[PDB]
Design an enzyme around this catalytic site. Sequence first.
Site, PDB file in Angstrom:
ATOM      1  N   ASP A   1      41.539 -62.777 -85.677  1.00 24.40           N
ATOM      2  CA  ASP A   1      40.575 -61.795 -85.198  1.00 24.40           C
ATOM      3  C   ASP A   1      41.293 -60.670 -84.464  1.00 24.40           C
ATOM      4  OD1 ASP A   1      38.989 -61.034 -82.467  1.00 24.40           O
ATOM      5  OD2 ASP A   1      37.610 -61.073 -84.175  1.00 24.40           O
TER       6      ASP A   1
ATOM      7  N   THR B   1      35.089 -53.292 -85.502  1.00 23.17           N
ATOM      8  CA  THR B   1      35.886 -53.111 -84.293  1.00 23.17           C
ATOM      9  C   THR B   1      37.360 -52.852 -84.580  1.00 23.17           C
ATOM     10  OG1 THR B   1      36.529 -54.153 -82.207  1.00 23.17           O
ATOM     11  CG2 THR B   1      36.226 -55.580 -84.127  1.00 23.17           C
ATOM     12  N   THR B   2      37.838 -53.162 -85.783  1.00 24.85           N
ATOM     13  CA  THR B   2      39.227 -52.909 -86.138  1.00 24.85           C
ATOM     14  C   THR B   2      39.400 -51.690 -87.027  1.00 24.85           C
ATOM     15  OG1 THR B   2      39.266 -54.234 -88.163  1.00 24.85           O
ATOM     16  CG2 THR B   2      39.517 -55.395 -86.072  1.00 24.85           C
TER      17      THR B   2
ATOM     18  N   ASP C   1      24.138 -58.576 -85.463  1.00 23.58           N
ATOM     19  CA  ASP C   1      24.370 -57.656 -86.571  1.00 23.58           C
ATOM     20  C   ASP C   1      23.091 -57.410 -87.363  1.00 23.58           C
ATOM     21  OD1 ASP C   1      24.883 -57.780 -89.752  1.00 23.58           O
ATOM     22  OD2 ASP C   1      26.366 -56.454 -88.827  1.00 23.58           O
TER      23      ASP C   1
END
Lengths: 72, 483, 218, 490, 477
Positions: free
Chosen positions: E45, E78-79, E344
């Site tokens: 993650d 988020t990445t 989500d």
Amino acid sequence: QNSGFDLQETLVKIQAEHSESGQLVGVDLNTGEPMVAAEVGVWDNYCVKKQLLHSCTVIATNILLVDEIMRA
Amino acid sequence: VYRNIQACKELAQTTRTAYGPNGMNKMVINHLEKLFVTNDAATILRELEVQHPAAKMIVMASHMQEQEVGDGTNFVLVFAGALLELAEELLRIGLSVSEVIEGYEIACRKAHEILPNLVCCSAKNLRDIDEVSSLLRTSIMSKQYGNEVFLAKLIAQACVSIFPDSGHFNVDNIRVCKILGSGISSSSVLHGMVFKKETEGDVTSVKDAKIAVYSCPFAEELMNFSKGEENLMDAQVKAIADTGANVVVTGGKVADMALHYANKYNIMLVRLNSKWDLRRLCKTVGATALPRLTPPVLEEMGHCDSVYLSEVGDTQVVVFKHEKEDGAISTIVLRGSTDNLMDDIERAVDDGVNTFKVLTRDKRLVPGGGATEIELAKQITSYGETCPGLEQYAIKKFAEAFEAIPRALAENSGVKANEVISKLYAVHQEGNKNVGLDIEAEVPAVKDMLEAGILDTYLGKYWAIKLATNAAVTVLRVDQIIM
Amino acid sequence: QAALAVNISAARGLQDVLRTNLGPKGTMKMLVSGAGDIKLTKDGNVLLHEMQIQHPTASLIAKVATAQDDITGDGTTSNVLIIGELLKQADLYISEGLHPRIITEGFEAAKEKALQFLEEVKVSREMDRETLIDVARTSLRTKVHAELADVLTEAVVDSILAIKKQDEPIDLFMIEIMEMKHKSETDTSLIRGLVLDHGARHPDMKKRVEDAYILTCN
Amino acid sequence: TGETIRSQNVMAAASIANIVKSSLGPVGLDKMLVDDIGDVTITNDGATILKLLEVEHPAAKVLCELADLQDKEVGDGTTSVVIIAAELLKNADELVKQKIHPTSVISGYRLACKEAVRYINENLIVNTDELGRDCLINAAKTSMSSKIIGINGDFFANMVVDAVLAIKYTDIRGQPRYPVNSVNILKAHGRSQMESMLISGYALNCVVGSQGMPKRIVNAKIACLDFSLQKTKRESDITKERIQKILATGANVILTTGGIDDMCLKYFVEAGAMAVRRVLKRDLKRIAKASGATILSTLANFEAAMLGQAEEVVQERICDDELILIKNTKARTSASIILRGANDFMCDEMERSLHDALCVVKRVLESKSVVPGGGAVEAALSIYLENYATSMGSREQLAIAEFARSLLVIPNTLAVNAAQDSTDLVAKLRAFHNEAQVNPERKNLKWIGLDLSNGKPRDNKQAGVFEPTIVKVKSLKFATEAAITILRID
Amino acid sequence: SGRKVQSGNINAAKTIADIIRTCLGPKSMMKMLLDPMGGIVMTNDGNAILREIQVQHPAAKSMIEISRTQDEEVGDGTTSVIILAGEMLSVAEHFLEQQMHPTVVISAYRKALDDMISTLKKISIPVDISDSDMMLNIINSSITTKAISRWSSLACNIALDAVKMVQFEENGRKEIDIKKYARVEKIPGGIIEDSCVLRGVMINKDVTHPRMRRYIKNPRIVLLDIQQLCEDIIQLKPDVVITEKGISDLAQHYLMRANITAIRRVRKTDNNRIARACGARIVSRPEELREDDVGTGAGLLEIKKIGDEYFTFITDCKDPKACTILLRGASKEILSEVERNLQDAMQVCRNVLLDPQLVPGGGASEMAVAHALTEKSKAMTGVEQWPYRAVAQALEVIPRTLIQNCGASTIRLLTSLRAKHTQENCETWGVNGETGTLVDMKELGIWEPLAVKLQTYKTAVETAVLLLRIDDIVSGH
Ligand SMILES: Nc1ncnc2c1ncn2[C@@H]1O[C@H](COP(=O)(O)OP(=O)(O)O)[C@@H](O)[C@H]1O
Ligand SMILES: Nc1ncnc2c1ncn2[C@@H]1O[C@H](COP(=O)(O)OP(=O)(O)O)[C@@H](O)[C@H]1O
Ligand SMILES: Nc1ncnc2c1ncn2[C@@H]1O[C@H](COP(=O)(O)OP(=O)(O)O)[C@@H](O)[C@H]1O
């Protein structure tokens, strides 16, 4: 590798094609695809291959049979 | 392979700033430790003894470029350096050398077949001395600064137009004689070949004169030795004066006895001859050297038609004219403070001569000053996205390498390269081919120079593009070697 | 690029250390502590739980391997050998590109095929005393001397066939291993019911109790 | 080791300037400030920069407190004063390095400061009068520039300047005064931003307290209250006696900040009042001071005359929103601006532009003496002082000359921070101001400065780029005092 | 100083950008973390690795904080934000070096982002709301490929109720939503299928002695923080009053005299959700007492003990904005994934209410927007167009990393994708994330929420302009 394509992938395709078909499938150095290699006129010499088969084996076994290098 | 690219990039960056009329001068210290100031790229590179073999390849490619075009070496260096530095990041992306090679070859062929579509050529012919002189201002502005081009173009073109026989033109006959003195404006043009002598016993109106070039230039017992020396000197001078010899040339000194002997047969004593003259005389009047003073024979003897001293430039110099071709040789007389700025002037003269010769091989001209470069870049980069495959990246990079040259010219002019290149590229879509960069304005403004007449050659540019592309391709192929 | 090589080297080192333990005829290692007391063992589980490993990811491998295979009986050293060989074989192809995801897909496909093969090879011969003898011998000769294992197989198999009457495998409490220090190690048998550690200060109170009632209640 | 300590002090001052140099101007870059614990700090203006900067050298520290005391006077130009002081220090140190004794330097700097401050008073502008309309509009648009809202921007500028001039105070001193919190933004729905017009007074979007309001009542006494009229189970249930008493006192429009009463509709149509909820306290004080009233802690115990009044109240639905038009009170302070669109969030740019236009117009309305912006003043002083020095005569020629040259460091910094070439723009400014004094015909060319929106020479008196005279005067005086104090140290 | 400070900032940015550039996609590589004691953890993650890693450069810390704060804002992506920002700064490398001021770069980036928003709003295929089939398709697109592959039904139903029990029609039409007022009850025990949804909040606390009435047909919950207040509550006589004070037996009978059922030892985490579910108002000041003291609470209550522990059941609330999603199972190793998946899904429902669209996934949207900008740049002029093309080109980073962590060669696949994509008019072809082969996303059934994409692009552009605006970092060490 020299043509730039993936090394193992090209050989995988070539072997997969040659398995089913008795035709000596070759490699096309512009698309990385199996090719019949007969009608394309990619023929190489024969006596060179015959001599190479001996000349590789002799040096291979000679080097593989060595032992205990000495400082003469 | 990255080390070779770095070496070529540094070599190109060294001489990039000298591009165009606004080239920085260089402090040149030769092997024998002599001061030298110049801005020509060929002069410094021919003095630059680089060590990296890739640099050797690119420099020898430039040398081959100068061989048959006579100029543009700075352009080919900048272009090849740009090509290699972009190929560096293309390799860093993960591509193969082979595929960028085919991409570059395709781009080069495309450029070659699209180049002849920019027709701003010579007006009518090599004649109309003033018109072609206005045409020849390109290389003059290139090497020498624009201040003196008005006179340099006329001096350079009036000399080359002396002998336009049968459409065949040659460079070796065109020579420049070194005459220090007053300012540049006092420089002029002359016909023939000019060099100076020492003695004043000179005859002007001379028929076919046989040139005698020397390979080797200049108490009782005391009286006996003096008389023997006198007899030997008299024998030597009478051997010189055999077969009705009327003119003799020598790189040595003079003497009262020697000049008395020379005037005994009424022969001028041409002395203090230049070191370069011994074989150029042989090639210009069919002369030959003499091992010593006794064996001048008619078979191994020179032949010049006019041998008279000229007082042009307030200096005593003998000029040979009305030769076998009757107009072949045509010198240029110079005038300046010192040889340092003389060198740049004569190099600009040589560049003008070479560009005129290229015009003799091609009456077709193309717009210059960043016009044709950005035009070809636009055409190629427009064709690039229409070609599927992996060669497309090489095509855009070849276009960017074309883009590099006007940027270099801009930053040499002292203006912001990015702004002017953006303005020029934007205007080129509708402000078509004839637009280009403006030197004088400090603001980065563009200017159409079809009217200006600053138009670089076509065949020279074609060969430059081809050879620079071939050089980049060849240097890209080599992988490594232990060093 | 190189982290993979480091992990490969650590796994190969662990495999090489644990090579000479698999099988009944394989030699056994011995463990020394800082105090001075030593342990002599050959089982992989205790070896991985007791070894003082240098390399970090080798310690990772040991810890995760013990944690996972605590569930099943044993096979720890065989698992370590197989994972080391897998890593080495994958390295021989990785060294020339061969992005690890493709090797992962090949590994998963081979796992599926091997699972089906094992499903269709397994032999369901009905249980009896002889098969339990054989299983006990095979599982015991790989942890102790030959004749000691042969002696202990009868005891363990008799205890287990006694236990099997419930028709459900249960363990821990129902089988208790008592420890004592008699010179004759050859004595090894099973006792039904319970065996208490010790008693109290009673001069010949009952001895042969025969029938008895148990209340305890502390 | 160590020599010519004044050189080290000048180098420290130059370093302090170089830390802040690039941050000057609205288009100046941001800075990262790191402390021991690693806190983050992003800012443009140099006042807070020096507030949070960790300075160590004593001479640099002196510049730090001089900038700080500059901040407490006018609150602007601290970057400019620091840069001017550093340039003066380096020029004077150079002058010392070619052996001119610093006493002449100090005398020349004092004389040049006096000459320049006298020149400012004779070449300032007082155009910020009632007749200044186009200049105000284009100054507000330059403050609002780089925004798409400029399609209807001229109408916004007109309405905002009209509102701020109408809301202008008249204090005891007599100088114009404007309350910033009096006017506020107000969203709207339906028609787009091209139809956002002016609102003559403060309006609150709430429930319709009394729709039967006359269009223009004879007297609307605003009575803001906090106690709600809710029934419970001087009165046990505060519903009738309070409102009846406040009506009998004289108040007409009684405002309750809390909720409405169940039967208040009948009372509020016969008494000309209405209960409007969600009254902002920052706006409740503003409307109280507009009417002339004050907030009541409790109605129990003033209301006959203390409660303010208005001469009209409008109750109508505008752009799909019903508003409480409590406008045209006793004192012109009640005002609001309607923002037409969808919500507050996407209209942040237009409300920010309106706020900045309000701020700049309120700054240029007061301090009637004003000067041109964009570096025009610096070029004018540089033209004046060089000639004045050349005509002065005494040993302080070079001091005043370098003072004049150092006054042109601000235009260079502005040009750099605007991404334009510094030398070209400053040369254009100086050449434009050359004929402003050399040729009396070009008398109006004095107001030529930089156009920061593009980086071109342009008149800024018309463009409205304006600064108070007092701010620049005190800035120059403080910079000269700091320069003298530093140069008198060795 | 000079260019060197910006170069340092953007190099520190690129390092932490490409430290985890491989960690996204359905075939993410797993990273290797070791602390200086021998402890070993294997992580897949991006948030976890960026949290555990320690770096000192202020630019890196700022971008890590940007990613961390964007994590809670939208969740997924988020990445991708970090990768996009790093690639944009790495391509801005080449323009910082050729001596152009950062201001024109910022202007070009802002123009590019303005085009970004419109282009994304254009190509996004519409999607309806609450329809089961494509909702489950979305669930497969995003929630799956994780540890809930065999238990997707529970997550599906929990999300389907959750997107309907937090509706806020405050200033518009249900466009307002929250993810913190859902009365989630993660209690271990029993099979994982024991989870259920109950309308209205419920409280883990109840009266110690259940010798008293709790459930009334009209629960008028009143919030509150000496018997004076107890018999001053009689102003309206609400049936149930929630407070935070202990109640004695005599005090309990005093409550009965006051017709109220107070509670004790209840935290604000329950009180705020009770207030949201019941829509009441809190008042305790004697002067503040009025007709608005008591607001009607829920519509029903129930007494029930589930799992041998005393609960309070506030069922059938007046406002279904704070309801209960009960969750029982083996342990919590499955339910954190359920929580993020329902977050989500609520974001997806909220944006479909806002903009009912789903941009194609697998880099198809990236290819579409890059093509749009690289074709629009040809018309507009100015030196600012170089960053305008550079951002579009560097936005290709998502497909290249997707192909990279798949085995297939990125260069050939990227060229095939782009060259196909240009000739294609409205195809939005993407790349399969599991096999690394070109495939139309409408066929593969992969899609992305529009709001999260807009947030990612806007945040990346804002971070780029923030890190390129900084002109110096020196304030000490
Ligand atoms: N007046 C001018 N304005 C703009 N460009 C010029 C001018 N004169 C020459 N050039 C450019 O200079 C280039 C050649 O200069 P340079 O590289 O110094 O020498 P070479 O001719 O050997 O390449 C030509 O391509 C031409 O376009
Ligand atoms: N739009 C503009 N164009 C040109 N100059 C401006 C503009 N806005 C402000 N300035 C200049 O900026 C100066 C103030 O900047 P600065 O010192 O950074 O403010 P502060 O002192 O509040 O930090 C003023 O002297 C003014 O001349
Ligand atoms: N199975 C898949 N096939 C193709 N693309 C995928 C697949 N799964 C995820 N993606 C793509 O990977 C991108 C990143 O999503 P993901 O890696 O799941 O979360 P994060 O963005 O937080 O790293 C998404 O934009 C999506 O388009």
